[PDB]
C-alpha cells in the first residue's frame, strides 16, 4: 500500500500519494536518514558493549618493580572470555533488534507489525551466513581457526536454529495465526535457559579455571582480554658362537650348530643336552635333549631351548649345552671346538626405580593444569603404589597459588610413566616468583604372584585377581581402606640356605625411589601477560578526553566528518570508569532505544512511500544495519583469538537472544495486554512462516559446510587454504542473496 501509518515519533509526510517524482524525493530523504541512523547506532552500540565489558571484568592493580627506587603503579582490567561473558556481549550487540521489536509493538498500540519480527528473522540470515562468511575470510592466509569445543557448539547451534523453528510452531502448529499468553512467556523463558547453560558450561563443560590462558590487549584504555590457548681335514661339528645371550621373556633361545670341513655329501649325527649351571632346569629353563641330523649339502642346524619366564627378581644366570656322540651313517666326523655353549639369561623382573625427570621445574601461573611425569627406571614388573603429596613453600597454596593434591599413583605391569596433575591458580601478576614442592613417598608392591609372595615373605591378605601373568594366578594385596568379603582374601604366608639366597635376591627387586624424589616447582608470571601490560604502558578529566577525541588520510577525513555529529553527541555519555561501567550502561541503552525508535519510523515510512513491504525492508535494510555491531565483534574474535569458538558463538548467541528476548518479550507484552481485554493476539503466520523455514534449510547447509571444513585438508572452520577459503565465503554470500530474494518474492506472492 501507499498509505503510511503515523509512527512513534515522526509525523506522516503529507499529502500522501503525491506524484511519482515526489516519491523519489521523499524516499531519498527516508533512506539517507535511515542510513545515518544506522551509522549512529553502530557507534553507540560499540560504546554500550564496551560498558558491558567493564562491568563483567575484574579490576587489578599492577605493581611494576624497577631497579631504581621509583616503581610506577598501574591499574588494568582483565575480561575473562567465557561463554557466560560472551553471551552477555552477544546480548549487548543485539539490543537494536531486541528494542525495535518491543518498541514497535508497544508504540503502535500492541498490534503485531511486520517490521520487528522480520528484522529478527532477517538478522539471523545476515548473522548466520554473511557474518560467518566474513569471519572465514578475515583469518590470515595459512592460519586456521578450529572449534575446539564441539560439544558446546552442537548444543548452542541447535538451540539457536530451534529458536526460529519454535517461532514457526506457535504461529502455524499450535493455535495457528494467534499467539497465546503461555506461548509468549515460554518464548521468553527460553532466554534464562541460555544463561544457565552458559554458567554450567564454564564450570563443567569447559573447565575454564584450568585451561591454558592467553592475554591480548582489549579495545579500551586499560582493558586486557584473557582467553583460552593451547598449552605448550675331516669334518668337525661345533657351536657357532660358544656363548649365547638371552632375556628371560624370550621364550626360546637360538643356538646354531655348524658342521664344517671334510665332505658335505655325507650324513652326520650329533647329540645335544642341557646341563644345569647357575640356572636350574625346570625353574629357569626347560630341559631339552635331542639329536641333530646333518643332511648331504647341509652345514648348519638351529636348535631351540625354552626359557621359563616368571615374576621374581634374579641375578644373571647361566646353563650349559653340550654336544656329544658324533656319528656317521654308512673318523670322518669329529667333535670340534667350541663343543659347549653357555647360555646366559638376563632377568627383567625388577619392580622399578621411581624418580622425577628434573629436580627443579619452572611453570607460569597461567598453565592451568601442570602435569609432572614420574618415571619408572630399570624394570617395570608388577603393580606398584607410589604415594605423592604437595608441600607448601613460598607459594602458600590452598587455592591461593595452587590447589593441594595428594594420593597414590598405581603403576601397572610394564608401565614406565605416570603423571601428576596439580592445579595452579592464575592471579595476573606482572612479576611473580613463588615456590612449592611435590614429593613422592616409599613405593609399595601391591600385586604379585603366589610364589613371589613366598619369596618376599609377604604376611598380608591377598585377593585373587582374574588376571593371569606368566601362566600363574595374580594376587593383589588388601589395603585397610578396602573392605572385602573376608572369604575372598587369602593369607599366602629350616631353610636350606639356597632358598634363603633365593629370597635375598628377590628382595633386591622390590620398588625403590630414584635420584629425584622431591620436585621444587617455581611459579612465575606469564610472559604473555607481562608483554601485554608492556604493550599498554607504551601507549596509554576523562570527560574532557572524550570531547577532544570526538573532533580530530583523505579516507579518514571522509569518515571523520561523516560521524563527527555522532561522536560529539555520544561524548556526553558518561565515561565508563564511573559507577564501574553502569553510568555508561544506563545512558547508552537509552540512546540505543531512542535511535531504534527513529529507525522503526524511518524504515516504516520508507517502505510505504515507494510501496515496499515492511517484510522486505526489514530483511534487506534493517537486518543488515542492526547487525553491524555483531559483525565487528565476531571479526575481531576471528582474527585475534586462536580458536573459532568466540567468533562463531557470537553469531549463535546473537541468533538465540534475538528470538527469545526480541520476540519473546514483545509478544509477551502484547499477548498479556490483549488477554486483560479478553481478546486474542493475532499474528499473521504466512509472512513469517516461509522465512523461518527458508532459514533453517539454509542454516543446516551452513552448519554442514562448517563441519566439513574440519578435515585435515582444510583444517578448521575459519581461514584454511585460500582456494577453499573463497568457495566457503562465496557460498555463504550466495545463501544470503538466495534467502533475501526468495523471501522478497514470497512476500509479494510470487511463490
Amino acid at each position, epitope marked *: 500500500s501507499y498509505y503510511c501509518k503515523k509512527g512513534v515519533i515522526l509525523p506522516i509526510w503529507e499529502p500522501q500519494d503525491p506524484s511519482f517524482g515526489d516519491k523519489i524525493a521523499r524516499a531519498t530523504v527516508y533512506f539517507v536518514a535511515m542510513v545515518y541512523m544506522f551509522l549512529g547506532v553502530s557507534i553507540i552500540a560499540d560504546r554500550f558493549m564496551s560498558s558491558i565489558e567493564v562491568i563483567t571484568s575484574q579490576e587489578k592493580e599492577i605493581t611494576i618493580k624497577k631497579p631504581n627506587g621509583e616503581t610506577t603503579k598501574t591499574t588494568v582490567r582483565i575480561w575473562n572470555e567465557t561463554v557466560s561473558n560472551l553471551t552477555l556481549m552477544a546480548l549487548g550487540s543485539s539490543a537494536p533488534e531486541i528494542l525495535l521489536s518491543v518498541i514497535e509493538v508497544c508504540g503502535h498500540n500492541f498490534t503485531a507489525g511486520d517490521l520487528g519480527p522480520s528484522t529478527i528473522v532477517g538478522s539471523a540470515a545476515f548473522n548466520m551466513f554473511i557474518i560467518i562468511a566474513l569471519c572465514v575470510y578475515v583469518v590470515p592466509d595459512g592460519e586456521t581457526r578450529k572449534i575446539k569445543h564441539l560439544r558446546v557448539f552442537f548444543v548452542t547451534a541447535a538451540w539457536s536454529i530451534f529458536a526460529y523453528t519454535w517461532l514457526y510452531i506457535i504461529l502455524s502448529v499450535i493455535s495457528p495465526g494467534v499467539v497465546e499468553v503461555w506461548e509468549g512467556l515460554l518464548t521468553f523463558f527460553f532466554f534464562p535457559i541460555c544463561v544457565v547453560f552458559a554458567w554450567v558450561a564454564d564450570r563443567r563443560l569447559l573447565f575454564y579455571k584450568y585451561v591454558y590462558k592467553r592475554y591480548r590487549a582489549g579495545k579500551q584504555r586499560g582493558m586486557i582480554i584473557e582467553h583460552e590457548g593451547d598449552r605448550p681335514p675331516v669334518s668337525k661339528i661345533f657351536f657357532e658362537q660358544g656363548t649365547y645371550q638371552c632375556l628371560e621373556n624370550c621364550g626360546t633361545v637360538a643356538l646354531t650348530i655348524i658342521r664344517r670341513g671334510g665332505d658335505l655329501t655325507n650324513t652326520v649325527f650329533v647329540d645335544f643336552r642341557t646341563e644345569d649351571g647357575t640356572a636350574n632346569a625346570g625353574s629357569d629353563y626347560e630341559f631339552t635333549e635331542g639329536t641333530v641330523v646333518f643332511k648331504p649339502g647341509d652345514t648348519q642346524k638351529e636348535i631351540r631351548v625354552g626359557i621359563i619366564d616368571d615374576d621374581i627378581f634374579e641375578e644373571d644366570e647361566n646353563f650349559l649345552v653340550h654336544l656329544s656322540n658324533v656319528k656317521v651313517s654308512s673318523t670322518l666326523a669329529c667333535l670340534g671346538s667350541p663343543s659347549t655353549a653357555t647360555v646366559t639369561i638376563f632377568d627383567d623382573d625388577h619392580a622399578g626405580i621411581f624418580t622425577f625427570e628434573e629436580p627443579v621445574t619452572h611453570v607460569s601461573e597461567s598453565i592451568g593444569i601442570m602435569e609432572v611425569k614420574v618415571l619408572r627406571t630399570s624394570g617395570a614388573r608388577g603393580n606398584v*603404589i607410589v*604415594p605423592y*603429596k604437595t*608441600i607448601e613453600g613460598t607459594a602458600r597454596g590452598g587455592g591461593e597459588d595452587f590447589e593441594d593434591t595428594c594420593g597414590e599413583l598405581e603403576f601397572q605391569n610394564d608401565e614406565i610413566v605416570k603423571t601428576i596433575s596439580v592445579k595452579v591458580i592464575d592471579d595476573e601478576e606482572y612479576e611473580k616468583n613463588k615456590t612449592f*614442592f611435590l*614429593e*613422592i*613417598g*616409599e613405593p*609399595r*608392591l*601391591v600385586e604379585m604372584s603366589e610364589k613371589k609372595a613366598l619369596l618376599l*615373605n*609377604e*604376611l*598380608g*591378605g591377598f585377593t585373587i585377581t582374574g588376571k593371569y601373568l606368566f601362566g600363574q594366578p595374580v594376587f593383589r*594385596k*588388601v*589395603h*585397610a*581402606r578396602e573392605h572385602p568379603i573376608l572369604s575372598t582374601v587369602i593369607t599366602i604366608a629350616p631353610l636350606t640356605s639356597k632358598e634363603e639366597e633365593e629370597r*635375598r635376591i628377590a628382595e633386591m627387586g622390590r620398588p*625403590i*625411589l630414584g*635420584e629425584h*624424589t*622431591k620436585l621444587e616447582v617455581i611459579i612465575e608470571e606469564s610472559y604473555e601477560f607481562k608483554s601485554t601490560v608492556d604493550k599498554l604502558i607504551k601507549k596509554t578529566n576523562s570527560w574532557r578526553e572524550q570531547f577532544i577525541e570526538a573532533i580530530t588520510s583523505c579516507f579518514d577525513y571522509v569518515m571523520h566528518f561523516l560521524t563527527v555529529f555522532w561522536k560529539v553527541l555520544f561524548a556526553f555519555v558518561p565515561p565508563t570508569e564511573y559507577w564501574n561501567g553502569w553510568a555508561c550502561f544506563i545512558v547508552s541503552i537509552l540512546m540505543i532505544g531512542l535511535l531504534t525508535a527513529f529507525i522503526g519510523d524511518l524504515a516504516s515510512h520508507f517502505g510505504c512511500t515507494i510501496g515496499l513491504k515492511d517484510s522486505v525492508t526489514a530483511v534487506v535494510f534493517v537486518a543488515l544495519g542492526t547487525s553491524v555491531p555483531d559483525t565487528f565483534a565476531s571479526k575481531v574474535a576471528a582474527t585475534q583469538d586462536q580458536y573459532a569458538d568466540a567468533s562463531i558463538g557470537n553469531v549463535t548467541g546473537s541468533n538465540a537472544v534475538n528470538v527469545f528476548l526480541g520476540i519473546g518479550v514483545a509478544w509477551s507484552i502484547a499477548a498479556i495486554y490483549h488477554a486483560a481485554n479478553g481478546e486474542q493476539f493475532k499474528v499473521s503466520p504466512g509472512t513469517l512462516a516461509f522465512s523461518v523455514t527458508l532459514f533453517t534449510i539454509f542454516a543446516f547447509i551452513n552448519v554442514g559446510v562448517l563441519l566439513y571444513r574440519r578435515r585435515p585438508e582444510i583444517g578448521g572452520e575459519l581461514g584454511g587454504p585460500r582456494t577453499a577459503k573463497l568457495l566457503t565465503s562465496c557460498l555463504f554470500v550466495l545463501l544470503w542473496l538466495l534467502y533475501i530474494f526468495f523471501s522478497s518474492l514470497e512476500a509479494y506472492c510470487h511463490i
Partner: antibody
Amino acid sequence: QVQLQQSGAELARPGASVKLSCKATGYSFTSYWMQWVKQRPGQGMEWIGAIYPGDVTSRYTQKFKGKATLTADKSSSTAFMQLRSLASEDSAVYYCARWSGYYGSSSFDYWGQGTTLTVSS
Amino acid sequence: QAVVTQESALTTSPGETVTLTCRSSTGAVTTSNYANWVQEKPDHLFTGLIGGTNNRVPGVPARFSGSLIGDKAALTITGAQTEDEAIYFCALWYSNHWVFGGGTKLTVLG
C-alpha cells in the same frame, strides 16, 4: 596429640621367643609407617625395620631379616615385633617411631617410651 | 655395611652456637642420604628433630637447623639452651637401610 605406648619390661630365657607391642594413638595408624629401632649401651642404635600396616608392607635389615618379624593389628591400632631364638646380644631397649612415608620429612617423628628386654638365665 | 662417625661429646655454654658432624664411611654425605637428626633426653626420651637434611619437625624449636658442610652432614644449634643437654644421633639412608651415628653427648653448663 600423637602417642606411641609400649609394653613393659620383659625377661626371656635364651633360645626362646618374645613379642613386643606398640599401640599408636592420635593419628591414622594404617596410613603411616612404623619404625622399629634397637638400642644397646655402647653400641649406638641399630635400625631393625619398618612396617606399613595398611598393606602390611615391610622393610628389614639383612641381619634382622630372620631374627625379627614385624606384624600389625589395625583393628586395635597396634604394631608388633617378634624376636625368635633369643641370645645374650638381644638384651636391649626397643623403640617404635612414626614415619610419614616420605624421606624429606623426619623418619623418626614420634618415639615410644622404649621396652627393655633382658635375655639371661 | 657403612659406619657413621660422630664426635664423642661436645661442651658449650648457654647462648652459644654449636655444630655437630655426621660423617659417612663410604664417602661424602649427599642429599640422597637423607640425614636425620634425633635427640635423646635423659631416661630414654627420644625426639625426632630434623629429617631430609633440611626439614625440621613441627614443634621443634627454631634454633635447630640441619645442613651439609663439606662432605658431611651437620646440625647447628644457635643460642643453645640449658635444656638442650642431650645425646644427638644422626641417621643416614643408604640403599635399603638406615645407619645411626654413635651419638654426641652434648652438655650445656649451668
